[PDB]
Design a protein around this ligand. Structure first.
Ligand SMILES: *[B]([O])([O])C1=[C][C]=[C]C(/[C]=[C]/C([O])=O)=[C]1
Length: 367
């Protein structure tokens, strides 16, 4: 069985990284032909020696954007919105602004014209300040020309998706998306009954950190989930057809690529690579420059189905937490790495690659 070699492989990938980045706790979940394998390391909380388990809740940060994309997928396949809709079509308070000339697709894929990585400090979690921010916003770049990774960009995408469905974003996620995907350990707001499972996050000098409120936090970076639940989400992405048709279609909608930057094809939330690919190249696709700097896009003649021999991934970080997810449809392989430190993306990719590559090499013919 390929499973027989997993424990040694995962320990080897994980433990050196945990040591070098002083990571208090880390959970791995791997799906091999739909069968889950869990590896838990260290402490969810140092103050009270609570061990990480597959049910420990971590902040997954921007991995939340794949859930947001799924809600948007559902809106799209229910004909509540279309990707070439003007943004202001779904929020009348934006009519007259730059959002008259920006598409939903632009927002979704960070190409609206240089919406920043995060809202300025001064924008509070308040409909009217958010509205006013977008009403006064002026672009850096022409739309559809430059990718600049952006919470306010895809955050507005998610918010407008919710508006097209006629319900608050948080309500749709909690009452329709999470249940559709069979996720009972996944939260935007961790309830009373589950607080005991919420890991502590650790920042510089081991400052304890859990994510605070912010504008469009639910849409951009607000999910808390367990390694076991996030692997259920990954398995739903590997086999959407196992869901009821509306939700199967919603997931398929997130697996469509619109443009390339270097080796990376941008989907809705998901970012995709050809598989196999080299470690160095996967790291560069997930680099600090990819996250922080503008990049010229190579637009595709037509949206590409992100299927077959490809790797789809998303990193996610908060002040206290560092997550990574990946799946490879042509290997029926899913992977989740959740940690309670924000440690470098390159190290997350190192772990994931050791695992993916290790499994790849058992499937060779001897001599
Ligand atoms: B991801 O994770 O990538 C992101 C982006 C942007 C922003 C954010 C926020 C965070 C906190 O605050 O935590 C995220």
């Amino acid at each position: 069985a390929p499973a027989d070699r997993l424990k040694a492989l995962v320990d080897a990938a994980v433990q050196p990284v945990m040591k070098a980045n002083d990571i208090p706790g880390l959970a791995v979940a791997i799906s091999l032909k739909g069968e889950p394998h869990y590896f838990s390391y260290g402490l969810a909380s140092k103050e009270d020696g609570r061990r990480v388990t597959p049910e420990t809740l971590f902040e997954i940060g921007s991995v939340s954007k794949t859930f947001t994309a799924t809600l948007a997928g559902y809106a799209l396949t229910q004909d509540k919105m279309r990707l070439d809709d003007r943004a202001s079509q779904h929020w009348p308070a934006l009519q007259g602004s730059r959002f008259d000339g920006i598409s939903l697709l632009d927002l979704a894929t960070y190409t609206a014209g240089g919406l920043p990585l995060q809202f300025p400090d001064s924008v509070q979690k308040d409909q009217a300040q958010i509205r006013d921010y977008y009403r006064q916003w002026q672009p850096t770049y022409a739309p559809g020309s430059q990718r600049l990774y952006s919470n306010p960009s895809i955050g507005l995408f998610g918010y407008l998706a919710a508006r097209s469905l006629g319900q608050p974003f948080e309500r749709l996620m909690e009452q329709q998306v999470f249940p559709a995907l069979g996720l009972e350990q996944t939260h935007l707001d961790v309830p009373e009954a589950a607080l005991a499972q919420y890991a502590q996050g650790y920042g510089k000098d081991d400052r304890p950190l859990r994510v605070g409120p912010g504008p469009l936090d639910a849409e951009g970076y607000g999910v808390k989930t367990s390694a076991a639940d996030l692997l259920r989400f990954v398995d739903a992405n590997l086999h959407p057809e196992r869901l009821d048709r509306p939700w199967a279609q919603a997931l398929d909608a997130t697996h469509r690529g619109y443009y390339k930057v270097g080796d990376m094809t941008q989907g809705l939330g998901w970012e995709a690579y050809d598989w196999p690919i080299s470690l160095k190249r996967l790291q560069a696709g997930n680099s600090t420059p990819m996250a922080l700097q503008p990049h010229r896009i190579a637009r595709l003649p037509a949206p590409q189905a992100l299927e077959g021999q490809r790797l789809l991934n998303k990193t996610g970080s908060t002040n206290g937490f560092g997550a990574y997810v990946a799946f490879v449809p042509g290997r029926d392989l899913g992977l989740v790495i959740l940690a309670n430190r924000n440690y470098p993306n390159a190290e997350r990719v190192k772990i994931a690659y050791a695992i993916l590559s290790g499994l790849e090499q058992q499937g060779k013919v001897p001599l």
